[model samples]
Target: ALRNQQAMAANLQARQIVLQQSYPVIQQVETQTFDPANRSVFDVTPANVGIVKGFLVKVTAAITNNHATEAVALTDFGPANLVQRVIYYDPDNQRHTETSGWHLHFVNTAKQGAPFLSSMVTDSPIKYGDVMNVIDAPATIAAGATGELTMYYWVPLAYSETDLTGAVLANVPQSKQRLKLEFANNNTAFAAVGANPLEAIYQGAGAADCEFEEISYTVYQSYLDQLPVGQNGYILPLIDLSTLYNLENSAQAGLTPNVDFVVQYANLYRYLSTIAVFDNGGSFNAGTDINYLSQRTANFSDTRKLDPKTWAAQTRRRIATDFPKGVYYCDNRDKPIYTLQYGNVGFVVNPKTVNQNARLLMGYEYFTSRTE
Candidate 1:
């Protein structure tokens, strides 16, 4: 019996070693120019890159025009004509792209002020032909000047035992996946302004509207232990919190009177660990008229009046202090899983919104074991 136990332990160690060795690390960089005659989709992914279970860590775009005499200005109309989506081929041989969750970074420029830097508006799904505007005005790329947009996406490798249940063997090909990027341009003519006189030189030239003298990308990759039988981490499907709260039409309001308003999950094994809320990048400011909270007197009269000056500050306070907390069972039975009160809610609000209404970003993480 002792020898049998030792043999099993050695086998497990050997399997772990094989899994680590099969992990792949990928990176790529490229420089390309866009012309009016050829406005094509830029393929960010290299042909040879592949991974089993992959996650994108970082991405960036840099725009420059070495034209000594001309200035490149983007038209004011349309969506911000910038990096659009990150596409990937999933394990099921289907294409899946994450257009909303990633972050956007605008390179600092002398003409563009700090207010121009902002996160992407992901409240709605990014569809085909959606336009983007360049908030940086004059929107001009002067002689020998450059502009860059950088994005970073990071997900830690921590996994629960439940994450590995039904795991594949080390040598098997898991996902065989790769990633790519998409780009677009403004539809109108550029306005010539600023110190440069030739700003509108390529205004309506199709591909010339936004000249990309150079474009590049770098990819980082790795792998982890495949799930064995009866272990794995479960990701709750995306939930739009707006669907639950009806601030738009007060007649359909869903907030109950003193019932703790809990959202529950089933078949959740109770190891009861780890929680993250994904907002999908929606705005949550009080300026938009979405009354997320109200301080009303016993007569039901709204005690808190709308003061544009202090509304944002006060709304932020309520979100921090009043979002609903998460609850779960550890053993898949009736037993409760206890977590710290404050962080268990993990609600993050969007800082930008024109309407007082706001939506909770949908996406959550939780870990469970087979026992509970």
Candidate 2:
């Protein structure tokens, strides 16, 4: 009987291990253009998965100027020029659109060793009609020289049927799922700088793909159990108290600035554990700036002034103040103020301040959990 029980347990463990395995689902698209048009666009659709975790984009181009005299600036050649725009749907059927600014990396190829430019977009989900663009030029290529450029994009997804709503993933039927992508150039004029007679050629190539993995609920649960209960993550909150008031001189402002630090806890499960405030010592001279000096907590109704001269630099101060958890606005007394001076404050929260398991809810039925 004992042998049979051990065998059953081993079988169960093996089954759980298999469930933790994951696979990659990738979609790649490439394009090359020689048109004088300066813009290029690409549309992408990711395969239906439990969750889309992150993405990467790379762009490279070759610029050749046939002119004999006109020199082009690096910016004019359209190197390291790209933007990504995405529109996605949430599990709740809400739509969100995000447009990234121009992505570029400046490198002096003339230098012996220089790094190329690449960008990554992460901590977000993949959606339909994703567009990638390479905008118009500035004229960076010199006459009789050739410049090369290339771009690549990679997206990773997680396929799990356990968590859905909290993970911020969509669960649309296969019939409603479709991935479509398109890339194009929008520039029409290849004119060079100062009537040089646009005699240049531009070429580009790029590809997009994704990798997928399957996460096991049992494994995830075991990992979650190892962390401190109710402890989700840490939140660093900064309060610029100096910006609230104006001061005339250093002496009048004393050794500290008079300002109030206010913070509202949006998450009920999280509690403020530690607080650190920066002290810019006396004179507000040229070098006095607020920096993280010490850690302390204030009482729920505690109000007091802080002096830089009394506290040593690079030391943590412990106070006897006790503040209750939850949302409550308290008045922090004014300390001192100097011309355009501010305080740097830090806050550490108790465990479980934010929903750490939200991503785990990606493909599961809509349900609230402890961390929710």
Candidate 3:
């Protein structure tokens, strides 16, 4: 027994030595100009890809509201209207994080000013895009003056070491991992955005326009000194805001019998949290008009029921006192797993639209390790 304990003690000491090996953190910055040929998609070619920190896009464009009769109202979305989506991908083309420019600016102090507890943790704090904020955020744009946009996208994986997002991202083959951004062309919600008014047209700085001055990305990499880590599988966090499903028109389109304002998910992926965005649709406020939901008895497959009144009251209390902006996120963020082996992981929501006029849309934030 003494001999066995001696070997075990020595083994643990070796493991600790490797785990806490001293390594200097090295970060590099890479910049690229706008590509006219592919204005919609911009690829971030990294310097020496290891763990990405974040990206900064300096978009330059003169936005013009083509509305001849009326002034377009943009009280919802801020400078987020410039670009549509910011995505982070691994070398195998696996998408880890996907979010809208609106969500980034709205959640940040860029548009709505600082929230209750949120802090602006940045290496550099200089900005040159506030001129466009006057026309797009908390104000109305008549002719759409000064739309040169600036946005930042922080990689979710690099947030913490305890989270799996950081674990897997660092283990990727240091070949050609990169980030791709998708831009939107037309401003004003051209399509249906829940209960919001649609078909507002404006010449946008989206995919259709060559509206980029420069894009800079700050990435983390292991050059001479490598990271102290072992073999571990990681669950990459992904935020998919594609299903901008209008809760108002959820069941009226076509009845499949189980139509009760339900948003269905068909995969083995577990859910983390969801941000419920409200405002006519394309135009939205990230912080003010949003509700965050996580870990509910009703979200399970074997569904646990709760009274609507009780649920609503409890949610309001949590948001008011604890979450502030309705966000339940943390450093090593992981919530209740809404998972199912087979069949659909359907989350039924009651968006009874009668007394209210504002339309609701949900941004599904879930995570999976699939290469997309």
Among these predicted structures, which one has the highest lDDT? 3
lDDT tens digits by residue: candidate 1, 1-372: 698577556545544543444443433334444532245354443333322223334434455555556656553221233444445543333443343221111111101222223334455656523244223334456666666644333222212122222121223254343455554333222333321111122242222334444333344543342223223331111111001110000011122322222222231322222121212122222233232322222243333433333543442343222111211101111232323321122122222223222223222223332123
Instruction: Give the poorly placed runs of model 3, Cα more than 4 Å off.
Output: 1-28, 32-38, 53-70, 103-138, 142-144, 147-149, 158-174, 186-225, 229-259, 265-267, 277-335, 340-345, 354-361, 369-372
258-281 per-residue lDDT for model 2 (tens digits): 233233222222221212211122
Give the TM-scores of the predictions, in the order they appear.
0.36, 0.31, 0.54
Winner on lDDT between 1 and 3 is: 3
Candidate 2 has an lDDT of 0.25
Q: After superposition, how far is residue 114 of candidate 2 from its true place, in Å?
A: 14
- RMSD (Cα, Å) of candidate 2? 20.3
Q: What's model 3's lDDT at 308?
A: 40
Q: Largest TM-score belongs to which candidate?
A: 3
Least accurate 10 contiguous residues by lDDT in model 3: 240-249
RMSD per candidate (Å) reads 15.0, 20.3, 9.7
- In the range 1-372, model 3's lDDT, one tens digit per residue, is 798577556544533443355333445444444433345567766454433433445443344344433444432343454556667655565556666655544333211223312333456557633333332232444533323434343334332232223222333455666666665544332222233322222322221331223322233333213434445422122221111111011212221222244455443555544444434233433233322222223335434323344434444443332222222221102443444544455544333222233443444444553432
